[PDB]
């Protein structure tokens, strides 16, 4: 690595960056590139998992909370449950009854409810001082090796590149995690570039890179408060406390006009690989929340948004509002059995992101749907 408190990706397991990175143009060099056979992807994926796991080791497990919960809605509305339960204290011979609010998605019915992962694994809470804001990481070559960069403006995923430069290392890449739309990445320079391993298959994903960003405004409007509960000897749990004001639904805002222009251009370039057929877009076809919705980390909260309002159109020869859901117990990178609990964040949350690309798949008129939960495709 080369990069530059306590961020989840700032473990200082690797060096600082070069303040003045060098690049050498190789005149008259042709090199065959293939993004689908690029082992740098596997390397990044592994390092990201490691940094995540290292960062979550030194903190509190919530196994003491796997008790039966008594949950109601008596003071919440005219998705959120008010649950009471017993916990331990620093004195092993004492117990007390406490209250907390939980999101419905994290609680499963069986003295009515249980946390969703108590019969499968231990839930570790996020270490409370560790933020999840992406830090650009540069990947740099060891002695004896070199990294070559392709500079062809219209280069897609594979083939000869006629302009190759040697670099000490890559630009910083932000480890942004998302499931349907790509956020905060690089833009294409001249046109939308559609990259795929095999554009004619249905078994392969399509990565579409935009040359213009679309802003997405996301918010969590509820004024949630934080309550700190002592479980044991220096073992603290952070529970959602009460909510001040109205209960409102989390959502994201996308401009209607930019979205439509973006699709006209995506379709225009898709018709260059496909014959002049009708192209339609549909919502993700199925699976769990992680795949059917667009997820992201906004300020430390984990959002799941309904994108059916975007991928619903037919193409032939105002503001869009996406409702969202919030979860505290998550299982990243499809690792079953390794849940993490995100402590609630005090106050209202707002963030503005750049949609820089899309992940699309094809159904066996051509049909495209958003999707692909395999993180290697983002990288």
């Amino acid at each position, epitope marked *: 690595c080369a990069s530059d408190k306590r961020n989840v990706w700032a473990t200082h397991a690797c060096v600082p960056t070069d303040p003045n990175p060098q690049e050498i143009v190789l005149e008259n060099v042709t090199e065959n590139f293939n993004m689908w056979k690029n082992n740098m992807v596997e390397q990044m994926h592994t390092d990201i998992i490691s940094l995540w796991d290292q960062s979550l080791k030194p903190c509190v497990k919530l196994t003491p909370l796997c008790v039966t919960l008594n949950c109601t809605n008596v003071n919440v509305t*005219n998705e959120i449950k008010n649950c009471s339960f017993n916990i331990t204290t620093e004195l092993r011979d004492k117990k007390k009854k406490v209250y907390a609010l939980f999101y419905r998605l994290d609680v499963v019915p069986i003295s009515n409810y249980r946390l969703i992962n108590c019969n499968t694994s231990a839930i570790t809470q996020a270490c409370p001082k560790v933020s999840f804001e992406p830090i650009p990481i540069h990947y740099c070559a060891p002695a004896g090796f070199a990294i070559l960069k392709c500079n062809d403006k219209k280069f897609n995923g594979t083939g000869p590149c006629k302009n190759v430069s040697t670099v000490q290392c890559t630009h910083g890449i932000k480890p942004v995690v998302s499931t349907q739309l790509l956020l905060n990445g690089s833009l294409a320079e001249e046109e939308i570039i559609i990259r795929s391993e095999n554009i004619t298959n249905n078994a392969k994903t399509i990565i579409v890179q935009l040359n213009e960003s679309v802003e997405i405004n996301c918010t969590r409007p509820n004024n949630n408060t934080r309550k700190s509960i002592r479980i044991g000897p220096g073992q603290w749990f952070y529970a959602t406390g009460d909510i001040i004001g109205d*209960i*409102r*639904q989390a*959502h994201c805002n996308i401009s209607g006009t930019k979205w439509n222009k973006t699709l006209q251009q995506v379709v225009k370039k898709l018709r260059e690989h496909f014959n002049n057929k009708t192209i339609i877009f549909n919502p993700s076809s199925g699976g769990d929340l992680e795949i059917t919705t667009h997820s992201f980390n906004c300020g430390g909260e984990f959002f799941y948004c309904n994108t059916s309002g975007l991928f619903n159109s037919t193409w032939i020869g105002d503001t869009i*509002t996406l409702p969202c859901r919030i979860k505290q117990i998550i299982n990243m990178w499809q690792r079953v059995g390794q849940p993490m609990y995100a402590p609630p964040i005090q106050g209202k949350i707002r963030c503005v992101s750049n949609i820089t690309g899309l992940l699309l798949t094809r159904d066996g008129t051509e049909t495209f749907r958003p999707g692909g939960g395999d993180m290697r495709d983002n990288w």
Partner: antibody
Amino acid sequence: QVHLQESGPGLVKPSETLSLTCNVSGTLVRDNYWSWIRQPLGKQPEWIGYVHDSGDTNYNPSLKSRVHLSLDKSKNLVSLRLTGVTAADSAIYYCATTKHGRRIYGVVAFKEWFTYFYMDVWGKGTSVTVS
Amino acid sequence: APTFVSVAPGQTARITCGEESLGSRSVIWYQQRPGQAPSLIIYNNNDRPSGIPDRFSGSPGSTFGTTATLTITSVEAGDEADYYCHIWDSRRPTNWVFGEGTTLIVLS
């Protein structure tokens, strides 16, 4: 100017049916929401329910099974019927028009709003005693 | 049932109602002259209907954690009435009853 003139039996006996009438004048019954309010002596008033056309009628949950409201468009009268009257039902009853509006606090598309009602035009009321 | 307050003529009266707000509200205030049907003074927190003077105003429904307040400035003899309050709240079931009111006593 709308005038609401009420009438009724005055005295009813326990377990009987109380039926009050609001004679509407200056407006037609079909163009207004109507509601009934009762005020036990010495107490703050209670909202019984409201009635209107297009099925927009609702009731105080404690009286839902006992109270029936209707609008007579031929007579321009508002009817209030309460059955199983007891000592607790002695009250001054009132006929009133109802206006409505909306309080919006969030996104309208997600229905983050509510309807509220208020009573602008009130009648004189009638005193009802249950023996 | 009612709360009793009193003011000298010309003084400002402060009338309160209900419990602390939980969510956004739309508070409706009514006035009852003894022996008469009540009438509306304020709806939607601060919108008075025609016929009600500027001396009658109320607290906003945009806040949380506080009770409803009716303010009557320059109180006169004609303001001696019970004041009632009906509160709608976005996080509560519909209130089918009025809360206990306040009797405003005008002195001298």
